[model samples]
Target: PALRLTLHNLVIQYASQGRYEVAVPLCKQALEDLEKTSGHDHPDVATMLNILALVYRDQNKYKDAAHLLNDALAIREKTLGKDHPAVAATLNNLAVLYGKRGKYKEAEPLCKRALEIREKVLGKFHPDVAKQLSNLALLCQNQGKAEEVEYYYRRALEIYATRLGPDDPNVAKTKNNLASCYLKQGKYQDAETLYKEILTRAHEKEFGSVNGENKPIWMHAEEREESACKVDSPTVNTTLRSLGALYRRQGKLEAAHTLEDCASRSR
Candidate 1:
């Protein structure tokens, strides 16, 4: 088990470097070792399953990811019980998978249950609660529940803004979600303001372009290696291209051209 854990850490470091070919095999073996040494029903095995599932997911092996996740969820729910945070986490992962596949019917109940369990066990003000709200809000957007998207997203924004502060990338991200909702609804001006603010905040938070002394979000290992995109910004290439596309839609030719130029120069 100790050896497996050590291997798992190395897998993480490799995975961070985008060396997934190396990380994937190492994790697969470690998972095999864990199951043999600790057995399938153990929490450690569940943890291994979850990590391996994510590695697979990152590789776009959604079917493999879902299979492993289902195993992890079953183990956690049986051993730790439904109300346990571990179970809730598993539920959340599966819910996200469903949401990604446009399986809204499967996704909704799982997301709701995860939120309810987290709020009950961890308290309503927790970051996990806010995250659950954000997940549901995102799911809602796909369900054609625009009003509820605003409701859940605003609630999530309030919690994140107060807890992490406004300039925090997490706060910016939730605001970005709201901005996307606005853009989808044709509220172009509101979307524009939020996008500009987020673009600024992301620049400062990730690269410290404006705040030289601020730590890059990449160094926050707990958050970064897991979901670095949320901890900071989308990749510079993607974000600039995305914003440039939006600018074109808005008929801001100068802004759009400038963004494409920046994107081209950097890459």
Candidate 2:
């Protein structure tokens, strides 16, 4: 069990670094080992399958990833119940997989299902539900469903601000998305206001809730590893770049150049 855990951890680290060649086999080996030791239908087995599916998905192996994700979904449903948060997590993965392939018909319902499950299990105000809303917002943006995009993003922003606080990086990230949406619609004033709000936190900082030590089994590797990867400054730079572009679009060349310089310097 310890060995399997170690292998899974290393697989995630390699996969995050884009070393899929090494990550894939390690993930497969860990999956095989866990299935043998814990039985094929164990929730842990599903977890392994989910990890491997993510690796496959990252590499654009859609067929293989979908197959593994379906298997993991079935195991999670059978062993952990249909409404289990782990099932929702796998659904989220499947949604992302299909969304990447531009299969909106396949992706949107899965995204909605995951959101429903999280909202039911984790509460509507929970950060996880906000994440789901954010995902749906991005999917809408890709499909050019602009109004729906703004609606989802605004809902997500509210949840993040109320639950995680307005200054949290999650709030900033959601606002960034909303601001980008505004910018696309030529709502320069709104976008500019949001960018300035994000710039209020000028320095890098890390702040988050929850820890993996007692994290629910539903927590995906990607979600946990994402928290501490340096939150504030990257978003600050992104906001700067975005605001600079907004300025340039309005023909404010001097202001745009000044903000662009700041963005590069911060980088």
Candidate 3:
């Protein structure tokens, strides 16, 4: 139990630091220990398997992650019951992994089931339900269902605003997702505003830590300014691409080419 808990915390630390390589071996060792101490069929063993699978998913090892997730799901279903929250969470995670890999058909049913279970068990506005909604919206967007994508995005955003609060990072992410939907529908001004808001909030939070007593004010201010200026260049590039695409679709080939050239140069 001690080893398992320690390993769990270590995995979280590594993940937060973007050190997945280190996290993966710890996850594997934890799983091995759990299985040895309990049994291969133990639900705790399944939990470790799911954790490792999540690491793989984040690293874009979709096939390997999916294989582990499928086995974990089967074990959870057999042991924890199909409608259990653990099972629902596993379903949600696997669905998102599949969605990232562009397996929309495989992702859809799992995400829908996860959403239904979360809403039924945890309430409609629960953060987990909001996450599942966001995942399903992403799947819809990838599948080119623009209207359905908007529906899910709006629902998720409402949940994030009410449940997590508008200033929360999750809410900011939802706003970004909503901006993507707006971009898809050619609502450029709305998309731009959302992007700018996200960037502003991100900068504020990132630089806010520099106000601590130990930090040098002049150095922190200079660093923050540099970081903020660096960030805007990418935003400008994305805006240029959006404009270029719009011009191209409208048959303004010369203007489109000029904008494309500007975007490439900015990059």
Candidate 4:
């Protein structure tokens, strides 16, 4: 079982780093091993399917992701019932995939149900609850309601900041998003502050993909870290572009060019 746990953790670690290519094979192998040892309908196999689905989702293999997610959901629903919090996780993820596919109407109800389930099972401030809220915010973002999008994003940010501390990458990413919401609303001062906080911390630690590679720093990691949450990463190039645009808007000519240049060359 040590090997199983190790393999599972390693796949998770690789997935966290956005190394889906490396993670997928390991996940598939784990699923094979688990199914043999524990049978196909085992909860662990469903878990592996969920993990594999996520990596597939990240890889933009939408059809494969959906098939795997459906299998995982069916097994979880059969064994754990449809009302379980774990089931809610799969529901929320499936809704997110639907949202990614531009099916907002379809995703909305699932997201709400997932949030409702987590709120009842795990409490309102739980990180999983925050994740559900953020997913709804993603749906909101594409629907063109900027204000609503920011509200949901800030709600998630509040939970993350309180539970995970301010320095966590998830918190920083939320702050960055909230800043983006501000930018879109012409709140230049607010956007500037958040971008500065992110950039400053980014300077304090290495963030994003490594080397002079084509892939964004968000995609591949040269080494692993103790805590994925502590890594302070998630789309560094996008952050650079956002900050660069902010500077350009403020007429800080040199700073604008600097960030833009960095964004251009960065992963």
Query: Of the candidates shown, which would achieve the greatest lDDT relative to the real structure?
Result: 2
Give the C-alpha lDDT of model 1.
0.71
lDDT, candidate 3, 120-216, per-residue tens: 8988788877877877887877787777877888898888878765457667666766777887898876775665555455445545754455342
Candidates 1 and 3 compared by TM-score, better number:
1
lDDT of each: 0.71, 0.73, 0.70, 0.71
**Residues 86-193, model 2: lDDT tens digits:** 889899889888876789877887898888888889887888688889888888777777777888899998888887755677888888989988878888888877
Cα lDDT for residue 122, candidate 3 = 84
Query: TM-score for all predictions?
Result: 0.55, 0.62, 0.54, 0.55
Q: On residues 82-128, what C-alpha lDDT tens digit does candidate 1 reach at each position? A: 89988888888888777777898778888988888988998888887
User: How many clashes does each candidate structure show, in the order listed?
Assistant: 0, 0, 0, 2
Models, CA RMSD each:
11.7, 13.1, 10.8, 13.0
Q: What digit string (tens of lDDT, one per residue) describes model 4 on residues 1-267?
A: 357655765666566575647646565655557665766576767887887788788779998888888888889889988679798889888987887788897787778778888888988798978877766876766676678778888889889888985467787777877887888898888887776666555654544453454333222211111122232234555676787676566566565565545565543
lDDT minimum window of 10 residues, candidate 1: 216-225
* Pairs of residues clashing in candidate 2: none
In model 2, the runs with Cα more than 4 Å from the true position are: 1-61, 71-86, 99-105, 201-232
Q: Clashing residue pairs in candidate 1, if any?
A: none
Cα TM-score of candidate 3: 0.54
Model 4, residue 188: distance off in Å is 2.3
